Design a protein around this ligand. Sequence first.
Ligand code: HEM
Ligand code: HEM
Ligand code: H4B
Ligand code: H4B
Ligand code: ZN
Lengths: 417, 417
Amino acid sequence: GPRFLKVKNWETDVVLTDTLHLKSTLETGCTEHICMGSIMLPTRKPEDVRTKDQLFPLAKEFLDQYYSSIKRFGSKAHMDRLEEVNKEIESTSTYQLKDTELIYGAKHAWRNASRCVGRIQWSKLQVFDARDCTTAHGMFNYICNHVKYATNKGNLRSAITIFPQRTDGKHDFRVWNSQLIRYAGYKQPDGSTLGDPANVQFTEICIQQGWKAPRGRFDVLPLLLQANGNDPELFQIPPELVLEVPIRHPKFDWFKDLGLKWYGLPAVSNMLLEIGGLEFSACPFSGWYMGTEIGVRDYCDNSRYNILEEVAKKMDLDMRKTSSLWKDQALVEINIAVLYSFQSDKVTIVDHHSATESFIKHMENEYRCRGGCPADWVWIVPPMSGSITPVFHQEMLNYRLTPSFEYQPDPWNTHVW
Amino acid sequence: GPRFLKVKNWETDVVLTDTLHLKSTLETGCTEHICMGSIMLPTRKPEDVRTKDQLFPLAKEFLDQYYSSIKRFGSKAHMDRLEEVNKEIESTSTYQLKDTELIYGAKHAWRNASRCVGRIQWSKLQVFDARDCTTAHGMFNYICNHVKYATNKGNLRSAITIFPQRTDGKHDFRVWNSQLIRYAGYKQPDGSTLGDPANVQFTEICIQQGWKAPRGRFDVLPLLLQANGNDPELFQIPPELVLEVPIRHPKFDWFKDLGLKWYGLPAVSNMLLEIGGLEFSACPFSGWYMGTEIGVRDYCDNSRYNILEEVAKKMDLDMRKTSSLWKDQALVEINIAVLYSFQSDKVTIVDHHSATESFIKHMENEYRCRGGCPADWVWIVPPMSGSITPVFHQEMLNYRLTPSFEYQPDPWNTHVW
Ligand code: HEM
Ligand code: HEM
Ligand SMILES: C[C@H](O)[C@H](O)[C@H]1CNc2nc(N)[nH]c(=O)c2N1
Ligand SMILES: C[C@H](O)[C@H](O)[C@H]1CNc2nc(N)[nH]c(=O)c2N1
Ligand SMILES: [Zn+2]
């Protein structure tokens, strides 16, 4: 309250002192009188994007941070690089990051992702430099290697692939897909929706672009890639590269008849990675699933597959009134299966209990070595059984540190010719 | 973003415009660069409490609000009351609220409780004026009537009992208990803890004050009441007034052997109610339980009864690794029983599904008639199955409106003689 902020865990009484929040460079969207802590989404006006004049301050901020990290703040190399980048900016209206800085930048962007519970792994990130890429077909190749390297035959590995930074002319690179691997969604005029409802619009775009949709329940969508600002091009991901897992239950043999399956590689590909002021509008990244993402959100959200109803009658659950908590029951079994299935097929996965416990272990390490750890409680607490996971009882300070990942508008909303 | 704030429901796409946040008078604890949205707890320095000079502005703020509510802002009655209260304050260094203002004040304090999911009922509040009370025995009688009126033989009714306001000498009134009805907690030097661990310290205080503890698992604690600032006095609540419910399962007949029971009346009694600047440090209030409060928090929290383990072996659940989600399974059954039991015993209760659905219906009504509804997502989303309740997907603006309920320090931490 007075000087430095404290966070307490109401299950263990542990109190931690936070000093890192003072490093905040971005705004939370909150004010002294309002809290937007549960708000999902808290170009430009002058130029189409950032400006050469405002770039160097942001570059200096990162470099200074960078050289401090390696304990060489104010050294020749540090002072030299600074002048060096100052020159590049004046000359070209931008600058290129060294390989080592790009790696530090990406890892720390992950370390600063307040909404990610899997941050105990932030330092094992494998960075793939795709800054020399120039065409969509080029992007496709870099993405295929990512998936193959990341999937690693079920023994998942964290990785991110960074494409060319945004500029002032050559346009930018974008993976139009929200995730590298996702299923299509079809809406019959019958009101019903075959597949993922969250992907209906994107699917419609793929079909208008020539995609010959198979009209199935679990049809993997084709990559829609944009390079150097040109029209996006369709690419089928090599099915041989897409590791999938059929969902069965370790007790209910009737579960398999639901005909459920999910892909093992979660790869977010619509976010923007910012480092030293440079904007990488194409930086697909991936780690591994936490069971609830699939069992709860993907399968049970009313707006998603919404299979609770279907899974309810199968169990013969009392669906007269919610008081029977049939929904709650159907929910647990679905998540037991998802975890059981992945673990049988030897595909990397983590249950919400081990995941949250690890995040807690991470928070403490960070408070000890870094003086804090920005965390978004609303995103960190699992979408089920929140109360019985260690993070529900953990107070969390949320703030924006840089480098960082950010949201960006969907490209099809402003693409031409 | 630009002018007025918007909130969107990501499950229905519904977007609501919030204008009520501009009515914020208190601070959230958040800044443009930090979010304390998950912080539990975000006297005085000069005087022991508030001051006569700062009281009239706060009184005027409330009265103005009050007369606006009844559509008579700026009328004779309004202007007269204002001058009238201005006089009382100068003369006595405080003022007395009219009955009608106290009622409006208490109902709106509830309407403004951002952390309460049961707010669709805010207008049916029954206010019991206990401002003439002067002694602890007097408090005991007012509390017994509250419980009896509130319990209503299982057909619960919302109510609050307001004791004398804080002053500058005659000291203040406090119900030392966190809740009117709660169970004791005993800590054997064997490390084990019989009863509610959250009540161990309070229990120890009751015993030092003369309470002859029965040393049982579900021993209702004696009321510890403080009046006019005197030492607190012990009172046994009439067992005949304490409605209890034995916990059984509608399917698992072995559940009853766990020997579980809980009380049907949840009554918070350690909060402070502030209206027009007046502070009521003793205002026990009550409504009815939402199943999860008991089934999840009271029974399953590691720091509470923590009966998951015990309930695990009974079910013969696979407790080799959390991946089996045995905890999650034990959790659902426990909550099915709690709800089943209360509904069998005809004691009012609400499941998290109907509760959250009603809160959503309430938010929309408020946005329509009041222009908004402050809500604390972190408290509104249930401690289990969050994702499948409508509120998980509902963005919520949090802000502090007055009148309101506030936290206060525990009295035993500063009581003398
Ligand atoms: C190693 C395994 C990892 C696990 C288990 C993990 C887990 C999670 C979970 C459960 C979420 C919630 C996503 C949602 O609800 O939509 C999340 C969010 C996020 N994770 Fe991690 N993560 C991992 C790897 C990664 C990697 C490789 C990066 C980047 C280097 C990263 C960046 C983020 C970001 C930025 C978000 C926010 C996404 C958004 O706001 O849409 N994560 N993560
Ligand atoms: C009519 C039935 C009601 C229901 C179902 C209901 C439900 C809830 C729930 C589930 C919580 C969470 C408590 C916790 O997790 O500790 C809560 C908090 C709260 N409710 Fe309500 N409530 C009701 C009546 C009342 C009444 C009568 C008042 C006052 C007039 C009120 C004031 C509050 C306040 C101030 C909190 C916050 C308590 C704290 O921060 O410790 N509620 N309520
Ligand atoms: C740390 C965190 O704020 C704390 O555990 C909160 C979370 N949400 C809650 N929500 C409700 N209804 N009740 C609580 O006691 C809590 N505890
Ligand atoms: C409205 C609210 O912010 C939204 O539903 C949030 C809540 N918490 C979440 N948490 C995670 N991990 N992922 C999500 O998509 C969400 N959705
Ligand atoms: Zn906030």
